[PDB]
Design a binder for this molecule. Structure first.
Ligand code: EYW
Ligand code: EYW
Ligand code: EYW
Ligand code: EYW
Lengths: 119, 120, 120, 118
C-alpha cells in the first residue's frame, strides 16, 4: 500500500518504493523552500505491521543536495501509513540545517505533513 | 572520512554508519533502551558537499524497530548535523512514531535529542 | 480575535482570554488522555502583531493536575492565530511527563493541534 | 525548588516563581536571537509531583515583545524539574513566528535547553 506517488498539503510529490526487506527508496520534490526538481530519499518501514488495524510506522530522509541546488540541510519525516479508501501517510518532520556552533540553537525546523494519493 | 565509523550516544546506544560518496548513510543501530534488542538496519542521507565556512554537515537517518528477533511497530528518525574536529560530534533531534489506532494517533510520536561521539 | 471558545480536531475545548498586556488566561478540557474536566492554562501572545498578513504568535501551558486527577505531566502549545477561510489557531505541542532519569528519553510526546471556533 | 534564577547552555537567564497553586511567573532574558533585555513569562507546573524520584513536569511561554523590541514570535518550553545536588530543568522548546500562510510550513523552530542553578 505504500509504494507509489503521494502528495502533501503543500503540493510536494513523494515517489516511493517499499521493498520486501523494509527499505524505502525514491524521490522527493518539494513545492516550497530552497529546492528544485527531485532529491534522493531513503528510509525504513515496518514490513510486518500489527494486524489489529494499527498504522504502519515508517520514516525517511532527504538531504537537500541534487545536481541543481544544495541547501545544506536535511529533512526527516517520521510517521505512519494508514490504508483504506482515504489512505494517508501522517508525518511529523525535522529539517536540520548545517550551522555554526553559535547558531546551532536555530538549526532545526519542525512541522507536520499529511500525504494522500490525490493532490 | 568523518561521518563513517562507530558512534555512541548519551544512552550508550551504538550507531555504526558508513557515509557513501553518493550522500547515502548505511549501517546498524543498537538501542540501549526501549523495546529493542540487538541490531537494526538504518539508512539515511547526508550533505556530501557541506559549506566550508565552519558550518556543520546536515544529515538524517531512519530505523524501523523490526529485526529478526523483535518488532516494536515503530520507527525513529534522527535529524541533525555532524560537527568535525578533535572531538567530533553528531548532534540530533529525533521523532519516534509508533503505529497506532486512529483514536490513539495523538500520542503516536515521542521527541528527543541524542548527541553522539566516537567514545565508547 | 483570540478571546473565545476554541475546539481542536480531537474535540478538546480551549477557553481563552487575551489580555491587553499580552496575557493568555483560561481553561483547557482534553477529549483524550489521562484528563477529566477543566485545567488551568496560562500563556502569552504578541499583542502588536505585524500588519503584513502574518499570523499572531502565541503559546500556552497546561499542567495536568486539577481537583479530580493528576497525570504528572504538562503540555505546551506553540503556534499562531490566523485568519483565512475561518478564524484558526494552528499549533504544535510538547507534552512532557515527570519521569525517572532512566525513563527521561521517553518523557516527551509531540503533536499538532488546529483550533477553530466551531462547536463539534 | 523551582523558584529562583536558572541559567541554560546558551547563557540565557530564566527567573521564575513557582506559586503554591501551580503558577509559574517571571522573566526571561535570551543570550541569542532577536531579543533585548527581559520578557514576561507565564506557565504552569505540577504542584504535587510524584515522590518516587520522578521529575516535576512544567512548561512556560515567552512572547518576544517587550518595551524595547518585538520579534513577532513566541517560545514554549516543556520539560521537567529534577531536584537534588545537581538540580536541573530539562526542556524541549517550540519557537513559532507569525508568518504568512504561504510561509507557515517554516514557522516553527525546535530545540532543547538544559537549565542549571549555577
Ligand atoms: O528549504 C530548505 C530545503 C527544502 C525544505 C522543504 C521542506 S521539507 C518539510 C516541508 N515539507 C515539504 O514538502 N516541504 C518542506 N532548506 C532550508 C535551508 C536553510 N534552512 C532550511
Ligand atoms: O521502544 C521502542 C523502540 C526503541 C526506541 C529507542 C529510542 S530511539 C530514540 C532514543 N535514542 C536511542 O538511542 N534509543 C531511544 N519503540 C516504542 C514502541 C511503543 N512506542 C515506542
Ligand atoms: O494524558 C496525559 C494528560 C492529557 C494530555 C492530552 C493531550 S495535550 C496534547 C493533545 N491535545 C489535546 O487536546 N489533548 C492531547 N498525560 C500523560 C501522562 C503520561 N504520559 C502523558
Ligand atoms: O529570535 C527570536 C526571539 C528570541 C528566541 C530565543 C530562543 S528561545 C529558545 C532558545 N533558548 C534561548 O534561551 N534562546 C533561544 N525570534 C525569531 C524571530 C524570527 N524567527 C524567530
Amino acid at each position: 500500500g505504500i509504494t507509489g506517488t503521494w502528495y502533501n498539503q503543500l503540493g510536494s510529490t513523494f515517489i516511493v518504493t517499499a521493498g520486501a526487506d523494509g527499505a524505502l527508496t525514491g524521490t522527493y520534490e518539494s513545492a516550497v523552500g530552497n529546492a528544485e526538481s527531485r532529491y534522493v530519499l531513503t528510509g525504513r518501514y515496518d514490513s510486518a505491521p500489527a494486524t489489529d488495524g494499527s498504522g504502519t510506522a515508517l520514516g525517511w530522509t532527504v538531504a537537500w543536495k541534487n545536481n541543481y541546488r544544495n541547501a545544506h540541510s536535511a529533512t526527516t519525516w517520521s510517521g505512519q501509513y494508514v490504508g483504506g479508501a482515504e489512505a494517508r501517510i501522517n508525518t511529523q518532520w525535522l529539517l536540520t540545517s548545517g550551522t555554526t556552533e553559535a547558531n546551532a540553537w536555530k538549526s532545526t525546523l519542525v512541522g507536520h505533513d499529511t500525504f494522500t494519493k490525490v493532490k
